[PDB]
Write a protein that binds this ligand. Sequence first.
Ligand SMILES: [Mg+2]
Ligand SMILES: [Mg+2]
Ligand SMILES: [Mg+2]
Ligand SMILES: [Mg+2]
Ligand SMILES: [Mg+2]
Ligand SMILES: [Mg+2]
Ligand SMILES: [Mg+2]
Ligand SMILES: [Mg+2]
Ligand SMILES: [Mg+2]
Ligand SMILES: [Mg+2]
Ligand SMILES: [Mg+2]
Ligand SMILES: [Mg+2]
Ligand SMILES: [Mg+2]
Ligand SMILES: [Mg+2]
Ligand SMILES: [Mg+2]
Ligand SMILES: [Mg+2]
Ligand SMILES: [Mg+2]
Ligand SMILES: [Mg+2]
Ligand SMILES: [Mg+2]
Ligand SMILES: [Mg+2]
Ligand SMILES: [Mg+2]
Ligand SMILES: [Mg+2]
Ligand SMILES: [Mg+2]
Ligand SMILES: [Mg+2]
Ligand SMILES: [Mg+2]
Ligand SMILES: [Mg+2]
Ligand SMILES: [Mg+2]
Ligand SMILES: [Mg+2]
Ligand SMILES: [Mg+2]
Ligand SMILES: [Mg+2]
Ligand SMILES: [Mg+2]
Ligand SMILES: [Mg+2]
Ligand SMILES: [Mg+2]
Ligand SMILES: [Mg+2]
Ligand SMILES: [Mg+2]
Ligand SMILES: [Mg+2]
Ligand SMILES: [Mg+2]
Ligand SMILES: [Mg+2]
Ligand SMILES: [Mg+2]
Ligand SMILES: [Mg+2]
Ligand SMILES: [Mg+2]
Ligand SMILES: [Mg+2]
Ligand SMILES: [Mg+2]
Ligand SMILES: [Mg+2]
Ligand SMILES: [Mg+2]
Ligand SMILES: [Mg+2]
Ligand SMILES: [Mg+2]
Ligand SMILES: [Mg+2]
Ligand SMILES: [Mg+2]
Ligand SMILES: [Mg+2]
Ligand SMILES: [Mg+2]
Ligand SMILES: [Mg+2]
Ligand SMILES: [Mg+2]
Ligand SMILES: [Mg+2]
Ligand SMILES: [Mg+2]
Ligand SMILES: [Mg+2]
Ligand SMILES: [Mg+2]
Ligand SMILES: [Mg+2]
Ligand SMILES: [Mg+2]
Ligand SMILES: [Mg+2]
Ligand SMILES: [Mg+2]
Ligand SMILES: [Mg+2]
Ligand SMILES: [Mg+2]
Ligand SMILES: [Mg+2]
Ligand SMILES: [Mg+2]
Ligand SMILES: [Mg+2]
Ligand SMILES: [Mg+2]
Ligand SMILES: [Mg+2]
Ligand SMILES: [Mg+2]
Ligand SMILES: [Mg+2]
Ligand SMILES: [Mg+2]
Ligand SMILES: [Mg+2]
Ligand SMILES: [Mg+2]
Ligand SMILES: [Mg+2]
Ligand SMILES: [Mg+2]
Ligand SMILES: [Mg+2]
Ligand SMILES: [Mg+2]
Ligand SMILES: [Mg+2]
Ligand SMILES: [Mg+2]
Ligand SMILES: [Mg+2]
Ligand SMILES: [Mg+2]
Ligand SMILES: [Mg+2]
Ligand SMILES: [Mg+2]
Ligand SMILES: [Mg+2]
Ligand SMILES: [Mg+2]
Ligand SMILES: [Mg+2]
Ligand SMILES: [Mg+2]
Ligand SMILES: [Mg+2]
Ligand SMILES: [Mg+2]
Ligand SMILES: [Mg+2]
Ligand SMILES: [Mg+2]
Ligand SMILES: [Mg+2]
Ligand SMILES: [Mg+2]
Ligand SMILES: [Mg+2]
Ligand SMILES: [Mg+2]
Ligand SMILES: [Mg+2]
Ligand SMILES: [Mg+2]
Ligand SMILES: [Mg+2]
Ligand SMILES: [Mg+2]
Ligand SMILES: [Mg+2]
Ligand SMILES: [Mg+2]
Ligand SMILES: [Mg+2]
Ligand SMILES: [Mg+2]
Ligand SMILES: [Mg+2]
Ligand SMILES: [Mg+2]
Ligand SMILES: [Mg+2]
Ligand SMILES: [Mg+2]
Ligand SMILES: [Mg+2]
Ligand SMILES: [Mg+2]
Ligand SMILES: [Mg+2]
Ligand SMILES: [Mg+2]
Ligand SMILES: [Mg+2]
Ligand SMILES: [Mg+2]
Ligand SMILES: [Mg+2]
Ligand SMILES: [Mg+2]
Ligand SMILES: [Mg+2]
Ligand SMILES: [Mg+2]
Ligand SMILES: [Mg+2]
Ligand SMILES: [Mg+2]
Ligand SMILES: [Mg+2]
Ligand SMILES: [Mg+2]
Ligand SMILES: [Mg+2]
Ligand SMILES: [Mg+2]
Ligand SMILES: [Mg+2]
Ligand SMILES: [Mg+2]
Ligand SMILES: [Mg+2]
Ligand SMILES: [Mg+2]
Ligand SMILES: [Mg+2]
Ligand SMILES: [Mg+2]
Ligand SMILES: [Mg+2]
Ligand SMILES: [Mg+2]
Ligand SMILES: [Mg+2]
Ligand SMILES: [Mg+2]
Ligand SMILES: [Mg+2]
Ligand SMILES: [Mg+2]
Ligand SMILES: [Mg+2]
Ligand SMILES: [Mg+2]
Ligand SMILES: [Mg+2]
Ligand SMILES: [Mg+2]
Ligand SMILES: [Mg+2]
Ligand SMILES: [Mg+2]
Ligand SMILES: [Mg+2]
Ligand SMILES: [Mg+2]
Ligand SMILES: [Mg+2]
Ligand SMILES: [Mg+2]
Ligand SMILES: [Mg+2]
Ligand SMILES: [Mg+2]
Ligand SMILES: [Mg+2]
Ligand SMILES: [Mg+2]
Ligand SMILES: [Mg+2]
Ligand SMILES: [Mg+2]
Ligand SMILES: [Mg+2]
Ligand SMILES: [Mg+2]
Ligand SMILES: [Mg+2]
Ligand SMILES: [Mg+2]
Ligand SMILES: [Mg+2]
Ligand SMILES: [Mg+2]
Ligand SMILES: [Mg+2]
Ligand SMILES: [Mg+2]
Ligand SMILES: [Mg+2]
Ligand SMILES: [Mg+2]
Ligand SMILES: [Mg+2]
Ligand SMILES: [Mg+2]
Ligand SMILES: [Mg+2]
Ligand SMILES: [Mg+2]
Ligand SMILES: [Mg+2]
Ligand SMILES: [Mg+2]
Ligand SMILES: [Mg+2]
Ligand SMILES: [Mg+2]
Ligand SMILES: [Mg+2]
Ligand SMILES: [Mg+2]
Ligand SMILES: [Mg+2]
Ligand SMILES: [Mg+2]
Ligand SMILES: [Mg+2]
Ligand SMILES: [Mg+2]
Ligand SMILES: [Mg+2]
Ligand SMILES: [Mg+2]
Ligand SMILES: [Mg+2]
Ligand SMILES: [Mg+2]
Ligand SMILES: [Mg+2]
Ligand SMILES: [Mg+2]
Ligand SMILES: [Mg+2]
Ligand SMILES: [Mg+2]
Ligand SMILES: [Mg+2]
Ligand SMILES: [Mg+2]
Ligand SMILES: [Mg+2]
Ligand SMILES: [Mg+2]
Ligand SMILES: [Mg+2]
Ligand SMILES: [Mg+2]
Ligand SMILES: [Mg+2]
Ligand SMILES: [Mg+2]
Ligand SMILES: [Mg+2]
Ligand SMILES: [Mg+2]
Ligand SMILES: [Mg+2]
Ligand SMILES: [Mg+2]
Ligand SMILES: [Mg+2]
Ligand SMILES: [Mg+2]
Ligand SMILES: [Mg+2]
Ligand SMILES: [Mg+2]
Ligand SMILES: [Mg+2]
Ligand SMILES: [Mg+2]
Ligand SMILES: [Mg+2]
Ligand SMILES: [Mg+2]
Ligand SMILES: [Mg+2]
Ligand SMILES: [Mg+2]
Ligand SMILES: [Mg+2]
Ligand SMILES: [Mg+2]
Ligand SMILES: [Mg+2]
Ligand SMILES: [Mg+2]
Ligand SMILES: [Mg+2]
Ligand SMILES: [Mg+2]
Ligand SMILES: [Mg+2]
Ligand SMILES: [Mg+2]
Ligand SMILES: [Mg+2]
Ligand SMILES: [Mg+2]
Ligand SMILES: [Mg+2]
Ligand SMILES: [Mg+2]
Ligand SMILES: [Mg+2]
Ligand SMILES: [Mg+2]
Ligand SMILES: [Mg+2]
Ligand SMILES: [Mg+2]
Ligand SMILES: [Mg+2]
Ligand SMILES: [Mg+2]
Ligand SMILES: [Mg+2]
Ligand SMILES: [Mg+2]
Ligand SMILES: [Mg+2]
Ligand SMILES: [Mg+2]
Ligand SMILES: [Zn+2]
Lengths: 116, 59, 48, 118, 112
Amino acid sequence: PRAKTGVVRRRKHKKILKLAKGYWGLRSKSFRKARETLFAAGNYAYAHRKRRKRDFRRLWIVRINAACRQHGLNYSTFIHGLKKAGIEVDRKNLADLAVREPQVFAELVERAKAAQ
Amino acid sequence: AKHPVPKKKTSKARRDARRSHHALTPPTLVPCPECKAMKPPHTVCPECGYYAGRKVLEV
Amino acid sequence: MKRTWQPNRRKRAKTHGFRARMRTPGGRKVLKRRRQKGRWRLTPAVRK
Amino acid sequence: MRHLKSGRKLNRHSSHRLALYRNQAKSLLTHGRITTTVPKAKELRGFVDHLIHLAKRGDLHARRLVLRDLQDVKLVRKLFDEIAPRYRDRQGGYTRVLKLAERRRGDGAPLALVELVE
Amino acid sequence: MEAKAIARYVRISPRKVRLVVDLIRGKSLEEARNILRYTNKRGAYFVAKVLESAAANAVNNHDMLEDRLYVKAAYVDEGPALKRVLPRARGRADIIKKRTSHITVILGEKHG
RNA sequence: AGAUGGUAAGGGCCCACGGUGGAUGCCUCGGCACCCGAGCCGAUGAAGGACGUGGCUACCUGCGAUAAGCCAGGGGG
RNA sequence: CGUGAGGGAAAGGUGAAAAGAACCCCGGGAGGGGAGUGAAAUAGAGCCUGAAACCGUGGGCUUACAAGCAGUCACGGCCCC
RNA sequence: GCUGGGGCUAGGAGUGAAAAGCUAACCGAGCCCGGAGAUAGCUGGUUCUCCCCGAAAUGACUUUAGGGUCAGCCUCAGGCG
RNA sequence: GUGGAGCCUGGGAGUGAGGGCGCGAGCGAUAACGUCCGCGUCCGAGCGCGGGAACAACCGAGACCGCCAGCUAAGGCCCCC
RNA sequence: GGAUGACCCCAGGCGGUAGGGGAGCGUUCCCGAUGCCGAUGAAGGCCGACCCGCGAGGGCGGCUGGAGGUAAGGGAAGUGCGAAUGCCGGCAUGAGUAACGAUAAAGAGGGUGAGAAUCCCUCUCGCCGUAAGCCCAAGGGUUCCUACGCAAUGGUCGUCAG
Ligand SMILES: [Mg+2]
Ligand SMILES: [Mg+2]
Ligand SMILES: [Mg+2]
Ligand SMILES: [Mg+2]
Ligand SMILES: [Mg+2]
Ligand SMILES: [Mg+2]
Ligand SMILES: [Mg+2]
Ligand SMILES: [Mg+2]
Ligand SMILES: [Mg+2]
Ligand SMILES: [Mg+2]
Ligand SMILES: [Mg+2]
Ligand SMILES: [Mg+2]
Ligand SMILES: [Mg+2]
Ligand SMILES: [Mg+2]
Ligand SMILES: [Mg+2]
Ligand SMILES: [Mg+2]
Ligand SMILES: [Mg+2]
Ligand SMILES: [Mg+2]
Ligand SMILES: [Mg+2]
Ligand SMILES: [Mg+2]
Ligand SMILES: [Mg+2]
Ligand SMILES: [Mg+2]
Ligand SMILES: [Mg+2]
Ligand SMILES: [Mg+2]
Ligand SMILES: [Mg+2]
Ligand SMILES: [Mg+2]
Ligand SMILES: [Mg+2]
Ligand SMILES: [Mg+2]
Ligand SMILES: [Mg+2]
Ligand SMILES: [Mg+2]
Ligand SMILES: [Mg+2]
Ligand SMILES: [Mg+2]
Ligand SMILES: [Mg+2]
Ligand SMILES: [Mg+2]
Ligand SMILES: [Mg+2]
Ligand SMILES: [Mg+2]
Ligand SMILES: [Mg+2]
Ligand SMILES: [Mg+2]
Ligand SMILES: [Mg+2]
Ligand SMILES: [Mg+2]
Ligand SMILES: [Mg+2]
Ligand SMILES: [Mg+2]
Ligand SMILES: [Mg+2]
Ligand SMILES: [Mg+2]
Ligand SMILES: [Mg+2]
Ligand SMILES: [Mg+2]
Ligand SMILES: [Mg+2]
Ligand SMILES: [Mg+2]
Ligand SMILES: [Mg+2]
Ligand SMILES: [Mg+2]
Ligand SMILES: [Mg+2]
Ligand SMILES: [Mg+2]
Ligand SMILES: [Mg+2]
Ligand SMILES: [Mg+2]
Ligand SMILES: [Mg+2]
Ligand SMILES: [Mg+2]
Ligand SMILES: [Mg+2]
Ligand SMILES: [Mg+2]
Ligand SMILES: [Mg+2]
Ligand SMILES: [Mg+2]
Ligand SMILES: [Mg+2]
Ligand SMILES: [Mg+2]
Ligand SMILES: [Mg+2]
Ligand SMILES: [Mg+2]
Ligand SMILES: [Mg+2]
Ligand SMILES: [Mg+2]
Ligand SMILES: [Mg+2]
Ligand SMILES: [Mg+2]
Ligand SMILES: [Mg+2]
Ligand SMILES: [Mg+2]
Ligand SMILES: [Mg+2]
Ligand SMILES: [Mg+2]
Ligand SMILES: [Mg+2]
Ligand SMILES: [Mg+2]
Ligand SMILES: [Mg+2]
Ligand SMILES: [Mg+2]
Ligand SMILES: [Mg+2]
Ligand SMILES: [Mg+2]
Ligand SMILES: [Mg+2]
Ligand SMILES: [Mg+2]
Ligand SMILES: [Mg+2]
Ligand SMILES: [Mg+2]
Ligand SMILES: [Mg+2]
Ligand SMILES: [Mg+2]
Ligand SMILES: [Mg+2]
Ligand SMILES: [Mg+2]
Ligand SMILES: [Mg+2]
Ligand SMILES: [Mg+2]
Ligand SMILES: [Mg+2]
Ligand SMILES: [Mg+2]
Ligand SMILES: [Mg+2]
Ligand SMILES: [Mg+2]
Ligand SMILES: [Mg+2]
Ligand SMILES: [Mg+2]
Ligand SMILES: [Mg+2]
Ligand SMILES: [Mg+2]
Ligand SMILES: [Mg+2]
Ligand SMILES: [Mg+2]
Ligand SMILES: [Mg+2]
Ligand SMILES: [Mg+2]
Ligand SMILES: [Mg+2]
Ligand SMILES: [Mg+2]
Ligand SMILES: [Mg+2]
Ligand SMILES: [Mg+2]
Ligand SMILES: [Mg+2]
Ligand SMILES: [Mg+2]
Ligand SMILES: [Mg+2]
Ligand SMILES: [Mg+2]
Ligand SMILES: [Mg+2]
Ligand SMILES: [Mg+2]
Ligand SMILES: [Mg+2]
Ligand SMILES: [Mg+2]
Ligand SMILES: [Mg+2]
Ligand SMILES: [Mg+2]
Ligand SMILES: [Mg+2]
Ligand SMILES: [Mg+2]
Ligand SMILES: [Mg+2]
Ligand SMILES: [Mg+2]
Ligand SMILES: [Mg+2]
Ligand SMILES: [Mg+2]
Ligand SMILES: [Mg+2]
Ligand SMILES: [Mg+2]
Ligand SMILES: [Mg+2]
Ligand SMILES: [Mg+2]
Ligand SMILES: [Mg+2]
Ligand SMILES: [Mg+2]
Ligand SMILES: [Mg+2]
Ligand SMILES: [Mg+2]
Ligand SMILES: [Mg+2]
Ligand SMILES: [Mg+2]
Ligand SMILES: [Mg+2]
Ligand SMILES: [Mg+2]
Ligand SMILES: [Mg+2]
Ligand SMILES: [Mg+2]
Ligand SMILES: [Mg+2]
Ligand SMILES: [Mg+2]
Ligand SMILES: [Mg+2]
Ligand SMILES: [Mg+2]
Ligand SMILES: [Mg+2]
Ligand SMILES: [Mg+2]
Ligand SMILES: [Mg+2]
Ligand SMILES: [Mg+2]
Ligand SMILES: [Mg+2]
Ligand SMILES: [Mg+2]
Ligand SMILES: [Mg+2]
Ligand SMILES: [Mg+2]
Ligand SMILES: [Mg+2]
Ligand SMILES: [Mg+2]
Ligand SMILES: [Mg+2]
Ligand SMILES: [Mg+2]
Ligand SMILES: [Mg+2]
Ligand SMILES: [Mg+2]
Ligand SMILES: [Mg+2]
Ligand SMILES: [Mg+2]
Ligand SMILES: [Mg+2]
Ligand SMILES: [Mg+2]
Ligand SMILES: [Mg+2]
Ligand SMILES: [Mg+2]
Ligand SMILES: [Mg+2]
Ligand SMILES: [Mg+2]
Ligand SMILES: [Mg+2]
Ligand SMILES: [Mg+2]
Ligand SMILES: [Mg+2]
Ligand SMILES: [Mg+2]
Ligand SMILES: [Mg+2]
Ligand SMILES: [Mg+2]
Ligand SMILES: [Mg+2]
Ligand SMILES: [Mg+2]
Ligand SMILES: [Mg+2]
Ligand SMILES: [Mg+2]
Ligand SMILES: [Mg+2]
Ligand SMILES: [Mg+2]
Ligand SMILES: [Mg+2]
Ligand SMILES: [Mg+2]
Ligand SMILES: [Mg+2]
Ligand SMILES: [Mg+2]
Ligand SMILES: [Mg+2]
Ligand SMILES: [Mg+2]
Ligand SMILES: [Mg+2]
Ligand SMILES: [Mg+2]
Ligand SMILES: [Mg+2]
Ligand SMILES: [Mg+2]
Ligand SMILES: [Mg+2]
Ligand SMILES: [Mg+2]
Ligand SMILES: [Mg+2]
Ligand SMILES: [Mg+2]
Ligand SMILES: [Mg+2]
Ligand SMILES: [Mg+2]
Ligand SMILES: [Mg+2]
Ligand SMILES: [Mg+2]
Ligand SMILES: [Mg+2]
Ligand SMILES: [Mg+2]
Ligand SMILES: [Mg+2]
Ligand SMILES: [Mg+2]
Ligand SMILES: [Mg+2]
Ligand SMILES: [Mg+2]
Ligand SMILES: [Mg+2]
Ligand SMILES: [Mg+2]
Ligand SMILES: [Mg+2]
Ligand SMILES: [Mg+2]
Ligand SMILES: [Mg+2]
Ligand SMILES: [Mg+2]
Ligand SMILES: [Mg+2]
Ligand SMILES: [Mg+2]
Ligand SMILES: [Mg+2]
Ligand SMILES: [Mg+2]
Ligand SMILES: [Mg+2]
Ligand SMILES: [Mg+2]
Ligand SMILES: [Mg+2]
Ligand SMILES: [Mg+2]
Ligand SMILES: [Mg+2]
Ligand SMILES: [Mg+2]
Ligand SMILES: [Mg+2]
Ligand SMILES: [Mg+2]
Ligand SMILES: [Mg+2]
Ligand SMILES: [Mg+2]
Ligand SMILES: [Mg+2]
Ligand SMILES: [Mg+2]
Ligand SMILES: [Mg+2]
Ligand SMILES: [Mg+2]
Ligand SMILES: [Mg+2]
Ligand SMILES: [Mg+2]
Ligand SMILES: [Mg+2]
Ligand SMILES: [Mg+2]
Ligand SMILES: [Mg+2]
Ligand SMILES: [Mg+2]
Ligand SMILES: [Mg+2]
Ligand SMILES: [Zn+2]
């Protein structure tokens, strides 16, 4: 019996081309160029999935640092303080506190200054 | 010469950017003061045969 | 310039013609072959 | 450059362009009105105006002058006897050019009429 | 209500007619007629016919009024191409495409 | 002094609908393989053809100046 | 195609049935628009299905101080459910 | 001397006032078909997915050195422990 | 010392152009991103991740997947960052 | 752990080229099939932000389509393409670009026609004239003449034409 391509390859290509919607020029219209683009895309996602965690901690730290210096001390001093104090609220929530609930953030700063 | 050649196929975008100047300008037309038909200025009216007040031509 | 094809009915008939083919063992084989292939022309057609 | 140069070339060599104006002259003096392309038309005016002006001189010398371009004795007789008198009091400008509104199909050339004034 | 005309297999290259069609899209039937009449292009003759046929259809089949018709939509699609041999130097042979257009004109009524 | 919006000649992404093109599925008057049957024709001019042949007939098919056919037996309705 | 021996293609599908679109309208014709046929006419003969590259028309978002393997991650604006 | 028509000589053969020139637009050995799917230790190419492991570019010999045979190094199965 | 240790018998291989760096030599000129051996290492195959401006093999470190959580490594903490 | 493949718990491994091994997906065909799904719509096509699967895939839904498709479990292979200056075809880019084939040359008026720089007629102009005129022979094979045509052929046009 003979088993020609038939329906199979077209279906495989549509898969890829659907994934490449939005891409520029032939990158969304040509199977070959789409496929190459998705390789790149796949690694970027993985890598940036990783870097998103870094990227946000960076933002938090910058933001905490700004709110610290308002009370006359820097980020390094603040964090060491909180360590001596036994306060384990992470920078995600610290940064939130710094903006949304400044009275509470002031308190944490005090504890920090005192713990040393 | 040594037979220059396109190094890369021109993108749909770039070929259409080239053509951004290719639109036709519509014909400039004015009413013939005699038969009110539309025709280009400074031409003998091709519908009634009048120009500068007088009949010049057999239409 | 003078090209390679210079038509000549006599030349054509005497060289590739039916009678020429029959004359020789190889030529008869040419005819046999073209008949087995089912050629519509065993021999170059030419007008006189 | 072309700085202050007079006279179209009309994509003809020297003797062709000459023949061109002469032949148009014959046609114009003959039928009173011809149709041509706009450039040939503007260029015809002066060439013919001069011929009419000489026929207004009427003398032998002038007839023999005109004959050099027009070549046809009868047509020149028409020029002197019928055409030129119309212009006895007219001071130049014996020809007019008016542009037609439609272009030639086969090449899009703009056309104009050249006629003798009244 | 709309009225349409199509000229299929017109032996002109689409890129060229489209230029002309672009001139009359969205124009009044009257302005379109004037435009086409003094558009120095081969294409103008073909567009004009499709325009005029659609106008006919409008008035005659679709109960629309001539004095209210306008070019609501128009477009040129590519038809099948006629491939022809163009002999070049050194024994080489090229292929000219003598191209083909499908011209559409759709009229609507500019009400009021 | 400062600040921020509407421009699209044209381009890009997405959606709808067309054009072009002829993949895919289905289809089969054709192929392929094996097996069985069968197996020479020709001077009584073969094989293979040329040219003809129809009321109107390009080609194919059939036929041979008795030319899409003549005679007789058989089949069939 | 080749002087020749010889080389050697491409090219299938309307519909159950031609019922293969009378007649009118624009057009020189081609083509189309109505009428009509059909279960179906984007089955209309350039005819089953009708993918893709490719070309176009309409709409949404976007773009004329900006640096690129064209993506990816985040956030905000606008449009839709 | 040039030229028309009619002829003859060809593939390791012809013909050549000799250039390995010419023998139907590529001649240090014409073209077609066949042997034939020659041979190619060379270059290219080799098509769904997931999971475990995971090298070598060294030694010996080799008309061998950009190829091989054996060993080394990887893997799987049974067995020993 | 219980390890993707080790041994034995079999099945399947691939490899038999390496390269940088460190240390020990020879050749070279106490030259070469030079060449040739020895021990090790990485790249090869970790052109995956951090550092080194950028950069296979230098420093840090062996990436099963996910998280808008925490601690460190080299290197850093004036602004780009 | 419990009965042994149910699931659960504790722990450890899980970068990877040449390459070894394991488990799967899908395509064509055969048994299953005198069956079953199917015009209340087969296959194929186009969507899908839905479901299942690590994945290859499998469902389900809407549109298209108009007559086929075939389960559980097995069997057999022309069984999966992105590259081979691959093969066949289709369509792009260069691009409205080079070119439109001797620089002997054109102009006007009249006519025909839906349409004319290009067809017919007239006048003017220019080119060959040991030819670019005429007559034979090769070779070509109806190209000759006339009517009726302009889709293609004609390097543009065409009402004209080999
Ligand atoms: Mg089959
Ligand atoms: Mg297959
Ligand atoms: Mg295949
Ligand atoms: Mg896409
Ligand atoms: Mg996008
Ligand atoms: Mg692209
Ligand atoms: Mg596309
Ligand atoms: Mg990837
Ligand atoms: Mg991650
Ligand atoms: Mg996180
Ligand atoms: Mg981290
Ligand atoms: Mg952020
Ligand atoms: Mg401070
Ligand atoms: Mg700490
Ligand atoms: Mg902390
Ligand atoms: Mg607030
Ligand atoms: Mg040169
Ligand atoms: Mg490009
Ligand atoms: Mg290009
Ligand atoms: Mg491209
Ligand atoms: Mg370009
Ligand atoms: Mg576009
Ligand atoms: Mg451009
Ligand atoms: Mg006036
Ligand atoms: Mg010569
Ligand atoms: Mg010759
Ligand atoms: Mg000679
Ligand atoms: Mg020939
Ligand atoms: Mg030839
Ligand atoms: Mg001869
Ligand atoms: Mg001769
Ligand atoms: Mg002869
Ligand atoms: Mg002879
Ligand atoms: Mg003979
Ligand atoms: Mg023999
Ligand atoms: Mg012979
Ligand atoms: Mg035959
Ligand atoms: Mg023969
Ligand atoms: Mg014969
Ligand atoms: Mg003869
Ligand atoms: Mg100059
Ligand atoms: Mg001046
Ligand atoms: Mg001037
Ligand atoms: Mg002058
Ligand atoms: Mg000028
Ligand atoms: Mg001129
Ligand atoms: Mg010039
Ligand atoms: Mg000229
Ligand atoms: Mg001269
Ligand atoms: Mg007159
Ligand atoms: Mg003067
Ligand atoms: Mg003179
Ligand atoms: Mg003169
Ligand atoms: Mg004008
Ligand atoms: Mg004008
Ligand atoms: Mg005009
Ligand atoms: Mg033209
Ligand atoms: Mg145009
Ligand atoms: Mg456009
Ligand atoms: Mg215009
Ligand atoms: Mg009307
Ligand atoms: Mg040429
Ligand atoms: Mg030639
Ligand atoms: Mg091309
Ligand atoms: Mg072409
Ligand atoms: Mg075309
Ligand atoms: Mg603004
Ligand atoms: Mg804007
Ligand atoms: Mg815009
Ligand atoms: Mg615009
Ligand atoms: Mg479509
Ligand atoms: Mg489409
Ligand atoms: Mg089947
Ligand atoms: Mg059969
Ligand atoms: Mg006998
Ligand atoms: Mg016989
Ligand atoms: Mg017959
Ligand atoms: Mg009988
Ligand atoms: Mg009987
Ligand atoms: Mg022949
Ligand atoms: Mg077909
Ligand atoms: Mg049928
Ligand atoms: Mg049928
Ligand atoms: Mg009709
Ligand atoms: Mg009519
Ligand atoms: Mg009519
Ligand atoms: Mg006609
Ligand atoms: Mg019709
Ligand atoms: Mg109709
Ligand atoms: Mg009905
Ligand atoms: Mg029904
Ligand atoms: Mg219809
Ligand atoms: Mg449909
Ligand atoms: Mg249908
Ligand atoms: Mg089709
Ligand atoms: Mg069917
Ligand atoms: Mg169809
Ligand atoms: Mg279609
Ligand atoms: Mg598109
Ligand atoms: Mg758009
Ligand atoms: Mg600036
Ligand atoms: Mg801006
Ligand atoms: Mg930018
Ligand atoms: Mg970049
Ligand atoms: Mg970005
Ligand atoms: Mg002699
Ligand atoms: Mg002789
Ligand atoms: Mg000779
Ligand atoms: Mg001879
Ligand atoms: Mg030989
Ligand atoms: Mg021989
Ligand atoms: Mg031989
Ligand atoms: Mg010899
Ligand atoms: Mg000699
Ligand atoms: Mg030959
Ligand atoms: Mg030769
Ligand atoms: Mg040899
Ligand atoms: Mg030869
Ligand atoms: Mg043979
Ligand atoms: Mg052999
Ligand atoms: Mg062979
Ligand atoms: Mg050999
Ligand atoms: Mg081989
Ligand atoms: Mg491992
Ligand atoms: Mg070795
Ligand atoms: Mg060594
Ligand atoms: Mg030896
Ligand atoms: Mg060697
Ligand atoms: Mg070698
Ligand atoms: Mg070797
Ligand atoms: Mg070995
Ligand atoms: Mg071992
Ligand atoms: Mg072993
Ligand atoms: Mg074991
Ligand atoms: Mg191991
Ligand atoms: Mg081991
Ligand atoms: Mg063990
Ligand atoms: Mg194996
Ligand atoms: Mg090896
Ligand atoms: Mg070796
Ligand atoms: Mg080496
Ligand atoms: Mg070695
Ligand atoms: Mg090593
Ligand atoms: Mg070494
Ligand atoms: Mg070495
Ligand atoms: Mg040291
Ligand atoms: Mg030293
Ligand atoms: Mg070295
Ligand atoms: Mg060194
Ligand atoms: Mg050294
Ligand atoms: Mg070592
Ligand atoms: Mg080493
Ligand atoms: Mg390697
Ligand atoms: Mg490694
Ligand atoms: Mg390692
Ligand atoms: Mg690199
Ligand atoms: Mg690295
Ligand atoms: Mg690094
Ligand atoms: Mg770095
Ligand atoms: Mg390096
Ligand atoms: Mg791990
Ligand atoms: Mg810390
Ligand atoms: Mg440190
Ligand atoms: Mg900072
Ligand atoms: Mg685990
Ligand atoms: Mg593991
Ligand atoms: Mg690990
Ligand atoms: Mg692994
Ligand atoms: Mg295994
Ligand atoms: Mg399954
Ligand atoms: Mg498959
Ligand atoms: Mg059955
Ligand atoms: Mg069945
Ligand atoms: Mg049922
Ligand atoms: Mg039904
Ligand atoms: Mg349905
Ligand atoms: Mg099937
Ligand atoms: Mg299926
Ligand atoms: Mg699916
Ligand atoms: Mg569905
Ligand atoms: Mg339906
Ligand atoms: Mg369906
Ligand atoms: Mg059936
Ligand atoms: Mg069974
Ligand atoms: Mg197999
Ligand atoms: Mg195969
Ligand atoms: Mg590949
Ligand atoms: Mg390919
Ligand atoms: Mg290529
Ligand atoms: Mg190439
Ligand atoms: Mg290339
Ligand atoms: Mg190849
Ligand atoms: Mg191709
Ligand atoms: Mg193109
Ligand atoms: Mg231009
Ligand atoms: Mg250019
Ligand atoms: Mg240019
Ligand atoms: Mg040329
Ligand atoms: Mg040009
Ligand atoms: Mg020419
Ligand atoms: Mg040419
Ligand atoms: Mg020329
Ligand atoms: Mg010229
Ligand atoms: Mg001269
Ligand atoms: Mg000229
Ligand atoms: Mg005329
Ligand atoms: Mg006229
Ligand atoms: Mg009449
Ligand atoms: Mg008339
Ligand atoms: Mg004409
Ligand atoms: Mg015309
Ligand atoms: Mg001419
Ligand atoms: Mg002369
Ligand atoms: Mg003479
Ligand atoms: Mg002479
Ligand atoms: Mg003869
Ligand atoms: Mg001939
Ligand atoms: Mg004929
Ligand atoms: Mg024609
Ligand atoms: Mg025509
Ligand atoms: Mg025509
Ligand atoms: Mg006809
Ligand atoms: Mg033509
Ligand atoms: Mg030509
Ligand atoms: Mg006619
Ligand atoms: Mg005629
Ligand atoms: Mg004739
Ligand atoms: Zn008027």
